[PDB]
């Protein structure tokens, strides 16, 4: 079992990035979730970059290189 | 079992990025979710970049290279 | 069992980054979650960078290199 | 069982970064969570950097290098 | 069982960075959590840096190097 | 059982960095938690640095090096 | 510089399997060489087998297999 | 510089399997070499087998296998 | 400089398996060499087997296997 | 400088398996060498086996295996 | 400088297995060498076995295994 | 400087297994060497076994194993 959450440069209001594994006889309730935004400037901004999602990376030679100038 | 969530440069209101695995006799309730936006400037912005989603990457030689100038 | 949460440069209001594993005969309640933003400047900002999510990285030779200039 | 939470450069209001493992006959309640922001300047800001999430890293030779100039 | 919480450069209001393991016949209640911010300057700021989350790192030779200039 | 909490450069209001292990027939209540901030300058600030979270690091030769200039 | 001599199942009389490299201002003399054979039985005999002479063998997968029954 | 001599199952009389490298201002003399054989039985005999002569063998997976039955 | 001599199951009379390196202002003499054989039985005999002569063998996985039945 | 001599199951008469390195202003003489054999039985006999001659063997995993039945 | 001589199961008469290094202004003489054999039985016999001659063996995992049954 | 001589299960007559290093202004004489054998039984016999000649053996894990049954 592999669980990997990556969260970056965001504005949230609730109930995020959750992992529920292997429950038995459970029960739950969540409530209302409000996002209210007025007059903001430069919210939720991210620079460059690549996103790799792999399971096995075998024998990688001179690979996975990112250059920023 | 492989679970990989990547979230970046966003504005949300609720109930995101969840992984529910291997439940038995469960039960749940979620509520209303409101997004209200007025008069914003430059929200949810992302720069360049590539997105790789693989399962196996074998013997990668001089590969997976991104250059930014 | 592998659980890895990485959270970075964000504004939240509640109920984030949770991992519930291996529960039996449980029960829970969560409440309302409000995000209210007015007149902000430069909220939730992130610089460059790459995101790798792998399970096995075997024999990586001269790999996984990021240069910033 | 592996649990790794990394949280960085954020503004929160409640109920974050929790790990609940191996409970039996439990029960719990959480309350309302409010985020109220007005007139701020430069909140939740992060510099550059890469995020690696792996389970096994075997025989890594001259790898995992980040340069900042 | 491995539990590692790292928290850095943040502003919180409550109920963070908790690990509940191996409970039986429990029960608990938490209260309301308010974040109120006005007129701040340079809150929740982080410099550069990389984030590695692994379980096993075997035979790493000349690896895991970060240079800052 | 391994439990490691590292907290650094933050402003909190309550109920943080807790580890509850191996309880039987327990019960508890927590109260309201308020964060109120006005007119501050340079709160919750962190310099550079990398974050490694591993379980086993075997045979690391000339590794895990960070240089600051 | 690569020099590989393999000699097998033979009858010789002299001056075999020599490698002279990188000489300067040299000089040499060899003598007479006589092979005299009478009435022999089953001299210089070899069983089956393949002869590979390569310089580079890269990425050979399930190759170079000889079966004898 | 690589020099590899393998000699097997032979009858010789003289001056075999020599490697002369990197000589300056030398000089030498060798004599007569006689092989005289009469009435022998089963001289210089070799069983099965393969002969590989390579310089580089890279990444050989499930290769170079000889079976004798 | 690499020098490897392997000699096996032989009958010789003289001046074998020599390596002369890095000589300056030398001089030498060798004499006569006689092999005389009469009426022998089963001289210079070798069983099965493979002969590998390589310089570099890199990353050999489940390779170089010989089975005798 | 590497010098490896392996000699096995042989009948010799003289001047074998020698390594002369790094001589200056030398001089030498060797004499006659006689091999005389009559009426022998089962001389110079070797069983099975493989001969590997390499310079570098890197990262050999489950390799170089010989089975005798 | 590496010098390794291995000699096994042989019949010799003289001047074997010698290593002369780093001589200056030398001089030497050797004499006659006679091998005389009559009527012998089972001389110079060797059982099974492999011969490895390497210079570097790095990171050998579950390798170099010989089984005799 | 490394010098390793291993000699096993042999019949010799003279001048074997010598190492002469680092001589200056020397001089020597050796005499005749006779091997005379008649009517012997089971001379110079060796059982099974492998011969490894390496210079560096680094990080050998579960390697170099010989089983005799």
Residue numbers in the entry:
A (entry chain I), B (entry chain K), C (entry chain G), D (entry chain E), E (entry chain C), F (entry chain A), ...: 1 to 69
From the paper:
The disease arises in mice and humans from the misfolding of the acute phase protein serum amyloid A1 (SAA1). To investigate the molecular basis of the systemic AA amyloidosis, we here use electron cryo-microscopy (cryo-EM) and determined the structures of AA amyloid fibrils from a patient and from a diseased mouse. The human fibril encloses a clearly discernible cavity that contains many charged and polar amino acid residues, making it likely that the vacant space in the cavity is filled with water. Both fibril proteins adopt all-beta folds and differ sharply from the known globular conformations of SAA family members. The murine and the human fibril possess in-register, parallel cross-β sheets and adopt highly similar β-arch conformations at the protein N-termini.
Corresponding to previous observations, mass spectrometry (MS) shows that the mouse fibril proteins are N-terminal fragments of murine mSAA1.1 protein with mSAA1.1(1–76), mSAA1.1(1–82), and mSAA1.1(1–83) being particularly abundant. The ordered part of the density of the mouse fibril corresponds to residues 1–69 of mSAA1.1, the ordered part of the human fibril to hSAA1.1 residues 2–55. The dominant morphology of the mouse shows a width of 11.8 ± 0.5 nm and a cross-over distance of 75.7 ± 1.3 nm. Platinum side shadowing and TEM demonstrate the left-hand twist of the mouse fibril and its underlying cross-β sheets. The fold of the murine protein is compact and shows a high degree of complementarity. In the murine fibril they wrap around the N-terminal β-arch such that the resulting protein fold superficially resembles the Greek key topology, similar to α-synuclein fibrils. Another substantial difference between the human and the murine fibril protein concerns the packing interface between the two protein stacks. This interface is extremely small in the murine fibril. Two residues (Asp59 and Arg61) make bidentate, reciprocal salt bridges with the respective residues in the opposing protein stack. Each human fibril protein interacts with ten other protein molecules. The non-planarity of the murine fibril protein originates from the tilt of the protein stacks with respect to the fibril axis and a GPGG motif (residues 47–50) that induces a ~5.5 Å height change of the polypeptide chain relative to the fibril axis.
